[PDB]
């Protein structure tokens, strides 16, 4: 019994079927593979096409999942898709009316076209099963919990009919108890509010991280006008007829000034985030207070995109409404993709389910075997030095104790947005300056942003207040108080309100990462590490060996630990040996606008990435000429001979484009199949 | 009291405050000037920046209005803006959250910045007045009707609160009787449906022209699921939770195929337009039946953008619900901008109103004086031949009788979308094949689109059935039946259903154009001409003399009559002497895409216009190199020397870009400031 689950839209690698999708539910394209009830492979497409939260059809992810499972396309019994057919096709039809050039191709024909052209897989129509969106969410969240009965809450932006659904789960049967209509969306409310802080889709958890810096009293009475709590667990959101955003009109009327991009977060912005967070908490806890006592369940599974609000999950934990709470590592639409596979399986016979509670999210492609990793590190020799210690974990723990910031790359990549010890950046959690520097110099992000700790399961209750219900802390699902007597000790990982989005790692959840944290604890007295995701501000979490080395070289990390090899940057790295390649979305432009006296303005040159929200950067006339000759095989040194050799200016200009990931730079060849 | 009326968004000529505005009510930007109760000047910005239905701040429209009034900016007593302030600023504020790079500048600051930077005008805050949107529509329509009381109906996409409003007007007072909420918009319903036909905003009139070719029975039961008529003149439009379009989901569910770009209009598409038109007619007649009976009134002014549905207007006229119906030449948001001026004047003092029903839309800038025009046609000498007849109108009437298709440019340009004898293309209305000959050669549009006739006041009733009420026909607001015994005679201007969108011209509405049609009638026995707008498929109606000559030279028009000069194209016109100029939105680009092997793809070259929905076109490497040296003074022939000379290929390629108006091409110099013609 082998079933594939899909989400996302249908565009190929270089083109978009339609420029703007105008919906929130096509993001985080992914593929999941279920065999005999167990989740054997799952990866988000963003890890493979390097476009954060991409909508593109998850073609590379399907291929990787099949390889990981040892399966061929013909072996797959069924494909589930995370939304019902008629809704998707109606949405496509509407987009085709506003893009009249696009051919009338609906989702069934598009899925099968992508699988046929991409994998040589002719999918029969009876094997493609479309699934109600919140049912797929609920299957994913509940079936991985280890629980045999539970209340299941789904909250996101929207499914086909509803923004929220409440289920009873028993054995493998779901029965709906409640739903909430689309204009009542709490995902929509939170995103509407996120736009007021100069952010967009995907930034909601940064807003969540900003909230503890704010006073929730300033805007409590304003947010009170946007929602009403009603009897029997009901609620209402008050719309307006002015704009497609619930929040901005009332806040404009009282003088709120939305943050411009690249500008600081004022106290008013912080206060705004704080009152937003409180508002969503009060509403969710209102829903759960009613449905806990009504349904009689002492256990909760919480899924949908809103279940990535770690603060909300911490409040749910502390509330006492449930004895046990479970959250899945990928609760946004990639998790609905996986749930679609279970629902498609349920429609073709009795449903096989997981035997145990999910403990590791390490489910994507690995980095490669020992021999191919060593050989590929040798190709990078002009840029790195490699040591091979006897006990890499023992050496890493000592480097951490000495104050070094480490890249850490092992095994199969994490499914869902959190790094958990397979694609991570770790450091000593004690000094507050580590938060300041790793924000400013390493991750290059805003100084308000918190950092999350990983602790050994044996020491967790020495440092963190887990009390209340039993929640699962293997995937950093819950924000949790740091014990007051440990907040000074844990200076880098204690947020301004005394909390921490904690990962509790065990020998069972992650044997190697647990050993690293335990050993660091023995050397220092403190078995806690800062754990942030291994990526710079221009990319999703690194996936391949070349991604890891590239990211190590374009971040300011002290040393990289990848599959027991210790990697450091050379004193002077030779960028000339790197082979430039366009990404499928890379574009090069020479542009003239109107100038004075209706002349043609002066030339400018620009590189950009062709997808909705893609960045762009100016390029010099000389680099523009160099980049025009990129053939995908010639090194950068040899390419630069034409423009008169690789100067320091060009190497430096090229390094900055590499760091923003406008093109791909890597030694000749590749690591080969894993 | 001198009062300026404004509509539109706030962008400068070359840049856009934000790329996409996401609303429908910023289009047709325009300026209007009011003095002592009378409309003394009005022009849409599209005529001056040459962008159809443009949203850009109408800085040029204001400048031209001030010059026609003989006023400094500082003489203006008040400025009225066509929407309430909080609504506009809430929309801007929302756009700023979608575009977090845009600085936080709201309408009051933006209006004042544009006037200050554009005209040196320091507008004091107490002179800027914001106006309820449907009141602005109502003032504009009612105050120019000449009636002393009327039922007033405004229907459009939306104002701040409503998609529709009903008023009783009397004297200068408006009293609201009813309103309809935004999601019930009939302008919105019509635009939603128009998208299913491969069209977009602005193309509603094309859908209205297609509707008579279709059978309305086919989709009548489908549209009936989307609306419900109710008691007391109420209706409901049934929404959905899937997409922001009322129409497409139900039609998808029944197998409708939305028309693709460049496809033919199938029979399904034709029936769809027919049933859509009938649906909107039914709903509006439902509204008007109730409010005629309830108000007891015999007179109707109809305004708002839906009032440009002349087929609907013809059905109101025939309904017998009213004795008198008036419709303003600019009933879309450029009319709201005009009405904002009157509302600003009422807001601060008593309100002066026009003394008479508006008979002429000839309110934009003129072409210039005789000396300026002849000196500038001399600048065009290497491309045109110019005669100077004794009686230009007599000559023109003779040429039309011989079968020539004329361009006709005189005096001040028409306010509103219809050409009415000041920027027109006219031809004999009898030959049926003048439709295909003008639709395919001079306008290059779709064959199904009819042409509209102009007829003298004296002859009108001999050819058209005007009955059912006294409507105003000086602006082509009404579609009317052509009398059955005249149809075959009027082959070029009779639609498939035997109707026509007629202009009745009089010695009062337009003396010169009346004289032309009357004289052509004496020559031929049929005092009726075809009258279409003077523009090709890529421009709004021509404005200046250079616009008129440029458009003549890039279509297949036989002769141009412009201010008593008779203009013909030379045998081989020398394109080399024209000076190329970028437009503010012109962009020139070399692109490289990613090759299939992760290489840089081969370089292509493109010219395009930087506004939402702007066209693009590929250019050759040699034309790319040439256009990159455009400096605004050097001629095209001299620029071509750097790439080997102005070969035939290059001249042909440049000409096609000129037809699409990607760049400005005109003789060195300028016609100069428009001369005071003493009016
Ligand atoms: Fe979802
Ligand atoms: Fe309007």
Numbering used by the authors:
A (entry chain A): 1 to 674
B (entry chain B): 1 to 679
Sentences from the paper on this structure:
Intriguingly, a water molecule (W′) interacting with the hydroxy group of Y82 appears near H27 in all experimental data, forming hydrogen-bonding interactions with the backbone amide and carbonyl of H27. Y82 was highly conserved in this subclade, and replacing Y82 with Phe abolished the activity, revealing the importance of Y82 in making water-mediated (W′) hydrogen bonds. To interpret the role of Y82, we determined the structure of mutant Y82F (2.30 Å resolution) and found it similar to that of apo GdmN, with the major difference occurring in loop 1. In Y82F, a substantial structural swing of loop 1 caused the side chain of H27 to rotate almost 125°, far away from the active center. Superimposition of the Y82F structure with that of the GdmN/AMP/1 complex revealed that loop 1 protruded into the binding pocket, causing steric clashes with 1, thereby leading to complete elimination of activity. Thus, our study revealed that Y82 is the keystone residue in the binding pocket in this CTase subclade.
Carbamoyltransferases (CTases) catalyze carbamoylation, an important modification for the bioactivity of many secondary metabolites with pharmaceutical applications. GdmN and Asm21 contribute to O-carbamoylation at the C7 (S configuration) of geldanamycin and ansamitocins, respectively. CTases in class III, which modify secondary metabolites, adopt two nucleophilic half-reactions, the formation of carbamoyl-AMP derived from ATP, CP, and Mg2+ and the subsequent transfer of the carbamoyl group from carbamoyl-AMP to the secondary metabolites. GdmN forms a face-to-face homodimer through unusual C-terminal domains, a previously unknown functional form for CTases.
